[model samples]
Target chain A: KPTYEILGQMDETFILVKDSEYLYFVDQHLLEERINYEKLKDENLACRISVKAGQKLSEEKIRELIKTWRNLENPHVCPHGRPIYYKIPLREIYEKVGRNY
Target chain B: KPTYEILGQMDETFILVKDSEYLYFVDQHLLEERINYEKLKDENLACRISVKAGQKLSEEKIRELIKTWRNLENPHVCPHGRPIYYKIPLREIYEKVGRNY
Candidate 1:
């Protein structure tokens, strides 16, 4: 079900998904949501103040990820809260194939 | 020679181009130069910011429509001056085809 891969974070946008399938075209607000999702899953809410780039990150590595972006503000950058990277729909797949809408 | 249509601007990036054939897997800094060429064609530069969307981003939205992202107090954001999205590339076509990098 998951499509996007985390690259590295510079500011708002995470530098992720080495290939196109896993990239997100997001800003700070969205990255925040994504980061928090992981925090809840990892049950690391106690130390949210000084949370680094590890858990709650888009992928396995947080601080030293080669492709992961850092310090994003919003995780809900995309409408469905899927991160801008996962926004691609089947409509896009058809277009890639040169099919008519 | 020319690719990437202009979509609307949200914060920094602009959505553009509808079809995959017209899409850009990479971002270009010369986009304004492109606009200038259009200015020469139409003889207008009176005022513009490049606004539009929905030819089908990926194909309609991602491959072409959507852009890479960025953060920081940058005048533009990403190093290439393209969206932070473009810095990341997609190799899925080859991957799906079982090709090696």
Candidate 2:
């Protein structure tokens, strides 16, 4: 839903997404859990895994998943209330790397 | 060298290293450039890809690479003067995820 370009996966865990001002590190497993929670409207759920790293995904699937995530009332955590993603500002990253931002 | 455990590689770009209190995201390309500079004592160098993701590496190699990085007088950047790594404290991550310290 948010304007983000999928960079790639990091360590087969987080989906690296780049936005204009921030980078979204989405957890593949928890994203799936959240999707399941939305579909079933259940609070209790267990997570296994989702997409694997280096596995090809179309832009359509990427947007669909992200749209589902954004449509949620609370996109911060999964259904079981675990951290689903980390959104870090580009400014923060630039500061960390000592780049001339 | 700093009592870090190599977790894995992130997108084959950053080596995920875990310290006692911090997570180290070491840029693989810049790391190699630093190593090359250390060996030849030259500032001018270019970097290509290092180890690919899922490529097997020995513990010896890991330790040696980390030791070399730690031994650098200025370990902040590569020979070409670029960011080599990012060290974020675990506390910071916990706070980001709304977890208790």
Candidate 3:
């Protein structure tokens, strides 16, 4: 089996992994969102979040949200189409942070 | 059925869409990559692009590429971990381009 090692993170936003001679940086939140999204989709469940009683959400409202999500050609975003994730190359990060020489 | 209207683009990199009062800006290449990625995964096909007289890619080489892709927890990137897509809100675009007024 092949595997990658988690080296560390950048500002708690990116998850850094090392694989062979390469490095991979991934957006933490976006990755979480994508995982959650895929799980919901694969399980054939609706995209409904069970929030603590900050506010009462109706079943109809949740149904509407799920309906919208399922209809998307690429449901890689929130209901409003906000992005869920970003992946960056390790070399790109080094250059951005001035670690590259 | 529901749909979004393409309201021009900020740069060639983004695909701007308007759905009701909401606006969505998607990275063109990333979106294309994600769509392509999902299609390949859904159809259980290996990701092999046909290049004309560019270089010889053996079956082992192609299999290695597909293996790396399949083993990934989040295959939202190329083998080297470069980002496949990004989604930004229209408001964010206006803010960046100084059109927010």
TM-score of each: 0.25, 0.55, 0.25
Q: Give per-residue CA lDDT, model 2, range B1-101, as digits (tens).
A: 45766755544455667666876777655676678777767655334444532455565666667778888876788766668887767565545544444
Superposed Cα deviation of residue A94, candidate 1 (Å): 11
Give the number of the best model, judged by DockQ.
2
DockQ of each: 0.04, 0.19, 0.02
TM-score of chain A of 2: 0.71
2 versus 3: better lDDT goes to: 2
Q: How do the residues A1-96 of candidate 1 rate in per-residue lDDT, one tens digit apiece?
A: 233333334322233232333334333333343455445543234224333333344444443333233443433332333333333343343333
Write one digit per residue (lDDT tens) for candidate 1, span B1-101: 23333333221222323232332332222233233333454323411333222222233333332332211233232222333222212243222222232
lDDT of 3 by residue, A1-101 (tens): 03444433333333344444443333334334444555575312223432221243344543343344334455454333445333334344233322322
Model 2 chain B worst lDDT run, 10 consecutive residues: B45-54
Better of 1 and 3 by lDDT: 3
lDDT of candidate 1 vs native? Answer: 0.32
The lDDT values for all models are: 0.32, 0.64, 0.37
The lDDT of model 2 is 0.64
TM-score of 1: 0.25
Clashes of each: 52, 0, 2
Q: Where in model 2 is the C-alpha error above 4 Å?
A: A1-16, A27-30, A45-67, A71-73, A78-83, B1-20, B27-30, B45-73, B77-83, B98-101
Position A59, candidate 1: lDDT: 40
Predicted candidate 1, C-alpha RMSD: 15.9
DockQ value for model 3: 0.02
